[PDB]
Amino acid sequence: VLCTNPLDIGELRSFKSKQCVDIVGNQGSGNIATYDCDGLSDQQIIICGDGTIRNEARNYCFTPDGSGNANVMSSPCTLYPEIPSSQRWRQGRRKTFTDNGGIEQVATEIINLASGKCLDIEGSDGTGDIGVYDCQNLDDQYFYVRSRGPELFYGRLRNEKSDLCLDVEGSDGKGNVLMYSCEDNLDQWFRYYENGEIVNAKSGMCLDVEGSDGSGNVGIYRCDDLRDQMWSRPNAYCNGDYCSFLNKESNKCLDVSGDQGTGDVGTWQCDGLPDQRFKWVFDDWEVPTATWNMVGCDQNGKVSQQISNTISFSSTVTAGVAVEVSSTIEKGVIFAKATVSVKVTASLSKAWTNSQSGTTAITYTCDNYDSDEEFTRGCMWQLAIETTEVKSGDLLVWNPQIVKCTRSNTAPGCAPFTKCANEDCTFCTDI
Ligand SMILES: CC(=O)N[C@@H]1[C@@H](O)[C@@H](O)[C@@H](CO)O[C@@H]1O
Ligand SMILES: CC(=O)N[C@@H]1[C@@H](O)[C@@H](O)[C@@H](CO)O[C@@H]1O
Ligand SMILES: CC(=O)N[C@@H]1[C@@H](O)[C@@H](O)[C@@H](CO)O[C@H]1O
Ligand SMILES: CC(=O)N[C@@H]1[C@@H](O)[C@@H](O)[C@@H](CO)O[C@H]1O
Ligand SMILES: CC(=O)N[C@@H]1[C@@H](O)[C@@H](O)[C@@H](CO)O[C@H]1O
Ligand SMILES: CC(=O)N[C@@H]1[C@@H](O)[C@@H](O)[C@@H](CO)O[C@H]1O
Ligand SMILES: [Ca+2]
Ligand SMILES: [Ca+2]
Ligand SMILES: [Ca+2]
Ligand SMILES: [Ca+2]
Ligand SMILES: [Ca+2]
Ligand SMILES: [Mg+2]
Ligand SMILES: [Mg+2]
């Protein structure tokens, strides 16, 4: 039912305008066009290994509305008799570029399997309605799944002067940022990326300075890709594990009013005082490891099984535990002795977060191998992710509804969010 073999999850953006590919409203169904990236789950696009393109708000598919140069909308996925070629997409030619945040991105044509037409934005400026059109090589026919680069750090941010935490007023992760007692609420948890964004765990929005010039009051606001939402954490400004954050637009320090570390937060001329340094506060979890478990095999037909999302742990997987685990996964995961790519860890982290508020069991059938050929025999494999909370020694095992269908009794040789390159899955593409 859901996409069991995803390749990537994130914002799908125009190479040309850098706008998000957007479904009208926030429910994950309706017309598709460009829009400002607004952090809602419908703009979390799922690139499925079966060729479909879906989203995190609703299990619907990018679909052309008819033949020829048609409009594209988010519509119900046709599953029977099979997924039609018209709801399936391949990648065409590629263009790479370094974005304003300094991250290497990879854009490609996105080409409909039925028509051979390119996903397209009306006109040439990369803004407006989205349909399918003759592939004509213009930049607005190239799309990338936005990478933030690696997650560098995460946790609450404890002030060196006051030992209070960087706080957002209330508990929804929206609004003014100020110093407050450290609390077991998610609005105090942030994740800091190579692109410079510091993203609030509760709201998914960005640490922001009022206006555009990087000087003034700090709060949480829609992530807008601007330089005043980019922060550096230079070694020079650290004192052990307490470091300053300098705004990229203004070169001013993240600052607490006065010198006691207790008041409102803004940006100000760096002054080297302890109230301008903060330490990341988080619990140690071991680097997670990914493996595949055999669910069933059939040497002379397709395999069909109930697939559940399950988690095992010594205590409750609270919102607190879940944020620790998500942030741990994003930092790095091991598969077959090697680290996986940034897009694998970003996507796995998103899958984990989206797995917390279930999740019912599905009946899944291996109709095709992960490599795309018709499944006539082989095994179904389900992902397992293991980590350990260091302070307790307690093992956490996560079995998401992520599956690989292969021709082989040998476990897949490919990490989740990468594609088996052959039927036996001995090497990989889309790493
Ligand atoms: C909150 C909400 O639903 N926002 C959506 C936004 O994401 C975008 O799709 C826009 C298109 O006109 O429609 C709404 O404003
Ligand atoms: C010495 C002292 O308190 N300096 C602070 C400075 O660090 C900054 O917070 C500024 C904000 O307006 O207020 C004071 O001047
Ligand atoms: C040169 C140019 O802008 N061509 C666009 C084309 O790319 C496509 O979007 C089409 C859809 O109707 O509109 C045309 O105006
Ligand atoms: C639709 C999609 O996933 N596109 C590309 C993907 O193919 C891969 O190259 C990746 C590397 O991070 O970047 C993405 O932008
Ligand atoms: C339960 C709750 O929302 N508490 C918040 C607190 O976390 C802090 O942000 C404070 C700042 O004045 O505002 C309170 O409303
Ligand atoms: C165009 C512009 O500068 N918009 C800023 C916005 O980025 C955000 O900082 C907001 C916070 O209130 O203030 C606005 O004035
Ligand atoms: Ca939307
Ligand atoms: Ca166009
Ligand atoms: Ca708060
Ligand atoms: Ca701003
Ligand atoms: Ca100060
Ligand atoms: Mg459209
Ligand atoms: Mg403030």
Side-chain angles (χ1 to χ4, degrees):
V1 210
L2 50 91
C3 175
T4 60
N5 61 338
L7 283 173
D8 208 356
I9 303 167
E11 294 176 346
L12 186 64
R13 292 198 188 206
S14 176
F15 178 72
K16 179 61 185 185
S17 63
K18 320 298 184 296
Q19 293 285 87
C20 274
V21 173
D22 170 71
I23 302 159
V24 354
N26 72 346
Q27 312 237 163
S29 60
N31 191 38
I32 293 169
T34 65
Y35 205 77
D36 286 359
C37 302
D38 63 12
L40 302 173
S41 64
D42 66 316
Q43 278 176 9
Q44 294 288 295
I45 300 312
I46 301 166
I47 305 301
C48 194
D50 66 8
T52 61
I53 298 167
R54 318 189 194 193
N55 75 83
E56 286 287 357
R58 187 156 198 187
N59 189 37
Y60 271 23
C61 283
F62 282 32
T63 307
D65 194 359
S67 58
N69 297 324
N71 185 44
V72 168
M73 306 187 29
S74 177
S75 318
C77 301
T78 310
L79 312 168
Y80 295 107
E82 66 191 37
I83 298 167
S85 63
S86 56
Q87 279 183 327
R88 295 176 63 213
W89 307 86
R90 56 178 196 90
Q91 295 183 327
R93 288 170 292 176
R94 91 200 288 261
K95 288 189 184 289
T96 72
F97 79 102
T98 302
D99 71 15
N100 286 338
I103 308 303
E104 297 306 307
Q105 307 287 355
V106 182
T108 72
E109 301 171 297
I110 296 182
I111 301 168
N112 191 268
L113 277 203
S115 69
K117 293 178 175 301
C118 276
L119 193 68
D120 172 70
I121 309 170
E122 59 160 318
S124 69
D125 69 356
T127 64
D129 292 346
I130 285 162
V132 295
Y133 193 76
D134 304 64
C135 292
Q136 24 78 304
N137 299 22
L138 301 178
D139 286 348
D140 66 306
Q141 284 185 359
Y142 288 79
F143 299 85
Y144 66 105
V145 175
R146 182 275 294 265
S147 170
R148 286 196 171 117
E151 187 197 47
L152 303 177
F153 298 92
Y154 53 82
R156 292 183 172 71
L157 280 160
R158 184 193 328 285
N159 195 265
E160 187 183 312
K161 181 56 176 165
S162 70
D163 297 318
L164 300 179
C165 281
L166 220 229
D167 173 61
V168 186
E169 134 152 57
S171 69
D172 60 354
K174 299 184 204 179
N176 186 51
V177 161
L178 69 163
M179 298 307 302
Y180 208 79
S181 305
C182 302
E183 296 175 330
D184 194 24
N185 264 145
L186 266 16
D187 69 321
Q188 289 183 358
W189 190 279
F190 296 88
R191 293 179 199 170
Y192 173 44
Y193 294 89
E194 179 60 29
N195 70 359
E197 291 180 317
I198 293 176
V199 182
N200 184 267
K202 181 61 169 175
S203 62
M205 295 155 61
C206 280
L207 193 68
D208 171 67
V209 188
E210 189 168 6
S212 57
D213 67 4
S215 294
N217 191 23
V218 163
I220 306 298
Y221 194 71
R222 182 190 71 84
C223 299
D224 64 10
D225 314 323
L226 299 180
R227 200 162 180 76
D228 69 314
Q229 292 188 356
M230 294 175 197
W231 304 88
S232 67
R233 191 183 176 263
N235 191 53
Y237 282 78
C238 298
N239 181 13
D241 284 314
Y242 291 81
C243 298
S244 294
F245 292 78
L246 276 69
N247 187 270
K248 301 202 191 191
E249 180 66 12
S250 66
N251 303 311
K252 284 177 177 180
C253 271
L254 187 67
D255 176 64
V256 188
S257 149
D259 68 2
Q260 290 304 297
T262 58
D264 208 342
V265 166
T267 58
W268 194 255
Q269 173 56 58
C270 297
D271 62 22
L273 299 182
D275 68 302
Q276 287 183 358
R277 292 185 294 275
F278 298 85
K279 167 183 187 164
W280 296 106
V281 178
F282 62 96
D283 279 341
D284 246 64
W285 288 71
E286 315 216 23
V287 181
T289 25
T291 56
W292 296 101
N293 292 315
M294 201 184 273
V295 186
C297 307
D298 190 357
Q299 16 173 9
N300 44 46
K302 291 179 180 183
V303 39
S304 248
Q305 251 333 328
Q306 304 296 25
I307 296 301
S308 295
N309 176 84
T310 64
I311 304 163
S312 86
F313 192 48
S314 67
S315 58
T316 292
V317 179
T318 60
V321 170
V323 80
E324 292 287 346
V325 173
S326 193
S327 303
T328 297
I329 290 166
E330 207 175 10
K331 188 80 192 280
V333 169
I334 296 156
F335 176 76
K337 314 195 301 194
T339 59
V340 302
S341 71
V342 166
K343 69 106 183 199
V344 178
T345 52
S347 298
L348 198 66
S349 168
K350 291 169 187 281
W352 161 262
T353 296
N354 304 344
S355 282
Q356 297 306 302
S357 54
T359 350
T360 57
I362 65 163
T363 308
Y364 184 66
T365 299
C366 283
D367 291 316
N368 298 97
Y369 301 118
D370 200 61
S371 53
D372 294 340
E373 299 82 2
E374 173 187 344
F375 191 104
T376 63
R377 60 184 227 256
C379 301
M380 191 189 290
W381 300 91
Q382 183 175 180
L383 184 67
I385 304 291
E386 253 181 19
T387 182
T388 300
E389 187 184 51
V390 173
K391 68 182 186 189
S392 63
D394 291 347
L395 179 74
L396 183 141
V397 181
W398 173 40
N399 307 287
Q401 302 172 300
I402 294 171
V403 177
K404 282 186 181 289
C405 297
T406 76
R407 193 175 62 186
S408 177
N409 318 91
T410 298
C414 299
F417 301 92
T418 76
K419 187 178 181 78
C420 295
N422 55 16
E423 298 94 325
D424 290 333
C425 195
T426 65
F427 73 108
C428 322
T429 64
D430 301 279
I431 64 181

